[PDB]
Write a protein that binds this ligand. Structure first.
Ligand SMILES: [Zn+2]
Ligand SMILES: [Zn+2]
Ligand SMILES: [Zn+2]
Ligand SMILES: [Zn+2]
Lengths: 446, 446
């Protein structure tokens, strides 16, 4: 099964045929891309808030308009999928979802209300793909650049009525029914420790400092509980690379930051009339970002290495979280940088998948975001910024769907790409819940 | 080759598996969708400004979130393509294109500057797919709901340095080098009369009232010239349906409106804080619409009928023009209505294509637009409006990328879907120029 080796403009963009991305007929290539054989492994790459606009903006800046993302754009089978949520009261569609509802959708196969994790509109728990993979004996990995308590990684191991219920404190207030001291299954963090994924890497060290209000580990901090339960704790790249094995007997838990991990690129925030009043911006690498802090690609590579030891197979979810966060903050450079960051992780995954031959790789987003690419001379009512691209040309980005604090998500259907066995199930129009069934079927989970 | 019969949510959106659009594995279906055999005909449906957001907004309103457009969403092979233009002076990419540059891209295979029609950045003419089809003996059709002088339909038959050069008057001022009395090929309208497509249907009657400044038909109106050249003039649905044949000896020219044809649905314009201050809107059919005015689907159906008589095959471009125009005017109902209107035309095309077996059908857009679907309680800086959907729920649309007069286009890559021989060439990431080469190859044009 081939990956798109190169879909960059083939020559001089000015001359006829120079902008082409295809060098010949693709029919044969696609035929060789189709297989219904069972998938032994599944790697799901999620670009939080990475809609088509985000991909295009990032490509334009980093690779040029005629450029090509060796990871993100390399997936041969493409399609568009819907991700609408539900109104808790009415049960009718809520056109603009959040991370909680969307993550729950692909991880459980049931739509839900914004803010919910692993539960439906009746607050009934729903088993997640990870829990199912684990039950079947497959290795499991949950990786993200955000706090491990954030919606996307949380949805795989937690079932709470509200995403805000990070640890003991918040749960007692926001999710009384889930609160341990009130007979519930516990907070997101507690349920995370319970679910026991073989590999869990990301940020969110902060919440682990809290103490359990009940249970066998009452009074101890969630960090202590983790150690008492056999988890291997890692806080930096050096130690991460030192891990030789990860399994149910010795699960890996890597906390590389108190909150969200560091952003790759720094840049000023978009401003009112920023494209006409202020100069064009050139993103600059974040000095904070460290050799001590592993990149998403490094975490992804280590995860695959450890998970691949399991002869039965594995399920791994990787998330480029800050694309969304930076989009909210109207920061082009941060947003774009995180997309480039995710691209590297996709490459690592695709490399392994190409060699393995029985791995389904999927790259998609939870929902669309605010950012739009607009004309250089645009006078918009929101936040704008001009950027110096790899093409030596200026690109203007606009965020104009909110006044308020952050920029809002949008309900537009978006790209979903895949490679490997059962990838055909992402072509055409599908729903986010279909992804659950596709992954479940590919893995032969029964 | 199968069309997606039904990709609507299969059941109760509230229950697990109820939101699914798939009922089983799609591998076999896709295999049966792949063919490299020659295409005898090609029908290209263009939704002007119909990016993924536009499709989703229209679906949500008209068919419900879990709905399914029997035309637009029915195409099995999907992908995303780039449509950036070029800066005339530098030759570097211009991330946000207009209709002229984008239409020229798919019709000639060469990138160009915004505003150009059938010419590159050196103002050199390049043969269009229509001209090539005609040269090879194939029947040709150019259909649009806009003025026939508008960029999209014009790009197929005209070569001018500026899209503004509608007729004699504008050309002498804006396109001196193209002006007939100055030795040029003439205005868009004159070149259209020129090009002599077998079938041309749309609006733009107004410009035909002008008089040629030179040539064999000097002093006569372009209307008179058309008649003197053998064109069959039609101004209404009744007369249109009366046409039994259309060919080079008796070409059809249907002018159904002075300017752009009537919009399908009426609704108020979006306003500042429209979603919170004003009530939810329910679109209403335009009384002006007319049994006397043929719909896009009717024009499409008649076109296919006449064009299908040509044993050699045919090329037909159909354009839902007002999607873009209404998007500019920040009018959700007009925009959505035109998307529904286009969907009907796609259904007619797909129906014929399914029966014929050797027809390549492509549905895409020239560029992305401004509209975004946002949360109900959103406080945005631009124009917003709440709409009562088929789901009995509220959807809010936002236009916030411009302050002046019309909302701007956006550079986001967008959906391209196809069905039939050679459709595989639209899957994955491609460029708008690739479409030219795909159509050329499919038709075996040499
Ligand atoms: Zn999100
Ligand atoms: Zn977000
Ligand atoms: Zn356009
Ligand atoms: Zn436009």
């Amino acid at each position: 099964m081939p990956v798109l080796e190169n879909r960059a403009a083939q020559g001089d963009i000015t001359a006829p045929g120079g902008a082409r991305r295809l060098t010949g007929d693709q029919t044969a290539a696609l035929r060789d891309s189709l297989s219904d054989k069972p998938a032994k492994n599944i790697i799901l790459l999620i670009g939080n808030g990475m809609g088509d606009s985000e991909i295009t903006a990032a490509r334009n800046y980093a690779e040029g308009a005629g450029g090509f993302f060796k990871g993100i754009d390399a997936l041969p089978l493409t399609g568009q999928y819907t991700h609408y949520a539900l109104n808790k009261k009415t049960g009718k569609p809520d056109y603009v979802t959040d991370s909680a509802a969307s993550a729950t959708a692909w991880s459980t196969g049931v739509k839900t209300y914004n803010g919910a994790l692993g539960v439906d509109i009746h607050e009934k728990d729903h088993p997640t793909i990870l829990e199912m993979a684990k039950a079947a004996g497959l290795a499991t990995g949950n990786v993200s650049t955000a706090e491990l308590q954030d919606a996307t990684p949380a949805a795989l191991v937690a079932h709470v009525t509200s995403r805000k219920c990070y640890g003991p404190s918040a749960t007692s207030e926001k999710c009384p029914g889930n609160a341990l001291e009130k007979g519930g299954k516990g907070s997101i963090t507690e349920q995370l420790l319970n679910a026991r994924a073989d590999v869990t890497l990301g940020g969110g060290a902060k919440t682990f400092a809290e103490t359990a209000t009940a249970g066998e580990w009452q009074g101890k901090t969630l960090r202590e509980q983790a150690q008492a339960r056999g988890y291997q704790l890692v806080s930096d790249a050096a130690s991460l690379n030192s891990v030789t094995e990860a399994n149910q007997q010795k699960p890996l838990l890597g906390l590389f930051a108190d909150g969200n991990m560091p952003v790759r690129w720094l840049g000023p925030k978009a401003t009112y009339h920023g494209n006409i009043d202020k100069p064009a911006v050139t993103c600059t690498p974040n000095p904070q970002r460290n050799d001590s802090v592993p990149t998403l690609a490094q975490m992804t590579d280590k995860a695959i290495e450890l998970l691949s030891k399991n002869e039965k197979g594995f399920f791994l979810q990787v998330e480029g979280a800050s694309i969304d966060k930076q989009d909210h903050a109207a920061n082009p450079c941060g947003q774009i940088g995180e997309t480039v960051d995710l691209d590297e992780a996709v490459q690592r995954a695709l490399e392994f998948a190409k060699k393995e031959g029985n791995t389904l790789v999927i790259v998609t987003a939870d929902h669309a975001h605010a950012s739009q690419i607009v004309a250089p001379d645009t006078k918009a009512p929101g936040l704008t910024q001009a950027l110096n691209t790899k093409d030596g040309a200026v690109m203007v980005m606009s965020y104009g769907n909110s006044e308020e604090d952050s920029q809002e998500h949008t309900g537009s259907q978006l790209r979903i790409a895949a490679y490997g066995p059962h990838a055909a199930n992402v072509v055409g129009l599908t729903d986010q819940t279909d992804l659950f069934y596709t992954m479940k079927a590919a893995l032969g989970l029964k």
